[PDB]
Design an enzyme around this catalytic site. Sequence first.
Site, PDB file in Angstrom:
ATOM      1  N   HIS A   1       0.849  -1.226   0.000  1.00 22.33           N
ATOM      2  CA  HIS A   1       0.000   0.000   0.000  1.00 22.33           C
ATOM      3  C   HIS A   1       0.879   1.269   0.000  1.00 22.33           C
ATOM      4  O   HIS A   1       0.355   2.362  -0.137  1.00 22.33           O
ATOM      5  CB  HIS A   1      -1.016  -0.026   1.222  1.00 22.33           C
TER       6      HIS A   1
ATOM      7  N   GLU B   1      19.327   7.257   8.220  1.00 25.05           N
ATOM      8  CA  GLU B   1      18.596   8.432   8.752  1.00 25.05           C
ATOM      9  C   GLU B   1      18.239   8.339  10.206  1.00 25.05           C
ATOM     10  O   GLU B   1      18.038   7.242  10.701  1.00 25.05           O
ATOM     11  CB  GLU B   1      17.208   8.613   8.033  1.00 25.05           C
TER      12      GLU B   1
ATOM     13  N   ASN C   1      17.248  11.941  12.018  1.00 24.58           N
ATOM     14  CA  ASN C   1      16.321  13.104  11.900  1.00 24.58           C
ATOM     15  C   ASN C   1      16.063  13.161  10.382  1.00 24.58           C
ATOM     16  O   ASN C   1      16.988  13.387   9.639  1.00 24.58           O
ATOM     17  CB  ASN C   1      17.013  14.387  12.352  1.00 24.58           C
TER      18      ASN C   1
ATOM     19  N   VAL D   1      17.039  16.741   8.763  1.00 23.55           N
ATOM     20  CA  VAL D   1      18.399  17.299   8.897  1.00 23.55           C
ATOM     21  C   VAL D   1      19.421  16.352   8.338  1.00 23.55           C
ATOM     22  O   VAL D   1      19.380  15.228   8.749  1.00 23.55           O
ATOM     23  CB  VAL D   1      18.725  17.541  10.399  1.00 23.55           C
TER      24      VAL D   1
ATOM     25  N   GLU E   1      23.591   9.688   6.039  1.00 23.98           N
ATOM     26  CA  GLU E   1      22.589   9.263   5.038  1.00 23.98           C
ATOM     27  C   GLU E   1      23.123   8.867   3.694  1.00 23.98           C
ATOM     28  O   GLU E   1      24.189   9.302   3.321  1.00 23.98           O
ATOM     29  CB  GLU E   1      21.572  10.392   4.721  1.00 23.98           C
TER      30      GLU E   1
ATOM     31  N   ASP F   1       0.096  -7.733   1.752  1.00 25.35           N
ATOM     32  CA  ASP F   1       0.614  -6.319   1.731  1.00 25.35           C
ATOM     33  C   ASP F   1       2.121  -6.225   1.872  1.00 25.35           C
ATOM     34  O   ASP F   1       2.648  -5.882   2.916  1.00 25.35           O
ATOM     35  CB  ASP F   1      -0.082  -5.500   2.885  1.00 25.35           C
TER      36      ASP F   1
ATOM     37  N   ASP G   1       1.292   1.626  20.070  1.00 24.88           N
ATOM     38  CA  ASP G   1       0.973   1.035  18.713  1.00 24.88           C
ATOM     39  C   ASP G   1       1.783   1.751  17.615  1.00 24.88           C
ATOM     40  O   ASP G   1       2.431   2.757  17.888  1.00 24.88           O
ATOM     41  CB  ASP G   1      -0.545   1.261  18.446  1.00 24.88           C
ATOM     42  N   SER G   2       1.726   1.208  16.410  1.00 21.78           N
ATOM     43  CA  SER G   2       2.418   1.829  15.253  1.00 21.78           C
ATOM     44  C   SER G   2       1.229   2.737  14.737  1.00 21.78           C
ATOM     45  O   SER G   2       0.095   2.622  15.209  1.00 21.78           O
ATOM     46  CB  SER G   2       2.836   0.741  14.204  1.00 21.78           C
TER      47      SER G   2
ATOM     48  N   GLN H   1      -0.100   5.720  11.256  1.00 23.35           N
ATOM     49  CA  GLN H   1       0.206   6.171   9.878  1.00 23.35           C
ATOM     50  C   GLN H   1       1.566   6.883   9.868  1.00 23.35           C
ATOM     51  O   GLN H   1       1.915   7.637  10.764  1.00 23.35           O
ATOM     52  CB  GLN H   1      -0.897   7.159   9.306  1.00 23.35           C
ATOM     53  N   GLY H   2       2.301   6.600   8.823  1.00 22.71           N
ATOM     54  CA  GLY H   2       3.658   7.208   8.667  1.00 22.71           C
ATOM     55  C   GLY H   2       4.678   6.123   8.965  1.00 22.71           C
ATOM     56  O   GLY H   2       5.811   6.201   8.530  1.00 22.71           O
TER      57      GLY H   2
ATOM     58  N   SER I   1       3.811   2.949   8.341  1.00 18.79           N
ATOM     59  CA  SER I   1       3.448   1.961   7.275  1.00 18.79           C
ATOM     60  C   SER I   1       4.668   1.528   6.465  1.00 18.79           C
ATOM     61  O   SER I   1       5.463   2.381   6.091  1.00 18.79           O
ATOM     62  CB  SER I   1       2.472   2.577   6.263  1.00 18.79           C
ATOM     63  N   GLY I   2       4.746   0.240   6.232  1.00 22.94           N
ATOM     64  CA  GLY I   2       5.877  -0.327   5.442  1.00 22.94           C
ATOM     65  C   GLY I   2       7.124  -0.656   6.273  1.00 22.94           C
ATOM     66  O   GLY I   2       8.005  -1.352   5.813  1.00 22.94           O
TER      67      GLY I   2
HETATM   68 CA   LIG Z   1      18.842  13.091   8.293  1.00 21.03          CA
HETATM   69 MG   LIG Z   2       8.487   2.509   9.744  1.00 22.80          MG
END
Ligand SMILES: [Ca+2]
Ligand SMILES: [Mg+2]
Length: 223
Positions: free
Chosen positions: A40, A52, A54, A57, A62, A84, A171-172, A174-175, A177-178
């Site tokens: 999804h 990553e 932050n 920043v 990265e 999924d 809990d986990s 939105q954001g 996801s995956g």
């Molecule tokens: Ca960063």
């Molecule tokens: Mg995640």
Amino acid sequence: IVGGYTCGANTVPYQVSLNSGYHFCGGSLINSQWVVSAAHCYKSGIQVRLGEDNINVVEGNEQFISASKSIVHPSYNSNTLNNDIMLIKLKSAASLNSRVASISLPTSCASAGTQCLISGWGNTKSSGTSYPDVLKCLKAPILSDSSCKSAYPGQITSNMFCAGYLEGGKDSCQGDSGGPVVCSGKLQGIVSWGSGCAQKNKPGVYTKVCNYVSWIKQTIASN
Ligand SMILES: [Ca+2]
Ligand SMILES: [Mg+2]
């Protein structure tokens, strides 16, 4: 992640942020050229961001690599979210080091009661919106399938499992996801769905990765 804690910079080295001009989903690095995320989270034009902490920043660790191809599971059903899972190939191989590492795929499925680590840059409020810029973590156990199916009647398939706290609070969301659900050093789940976040009797639902290892191995070796 609601009710979790700040992980600490690069303490979850296999965690990835999928960016299409902004962070929209998490993912897991399984080897230098491949990432697994949720189907999804599919979008055209994804840049994978590794090392990553932050996401607003550039802290120095990265690696931003564009995806060359994405493969959504052949049987993904967007209406029920069954199967999924999706694979993303990087245009260039990532450089693994302490801050960027891959996570192992499971040899067997995990038992109810096993504690796992869930991480991501998703919403941190159950009722409200607050998106953090640093990675958040949550330790949560896999719940029995009976408690999972009683919470969501007729909606859980054998390719899903629930993890969390029935009392709510943690809990986990939105954001997230995956992103990864790692138990005993293996990637056992992918943040997929749930009902709101951290609500009583509404645990999170995760893709059961142990059911897709052959498809993953076969697919990455042929692409
Ligand atoms: Ca960063
Ligand atoms: Mg995640």
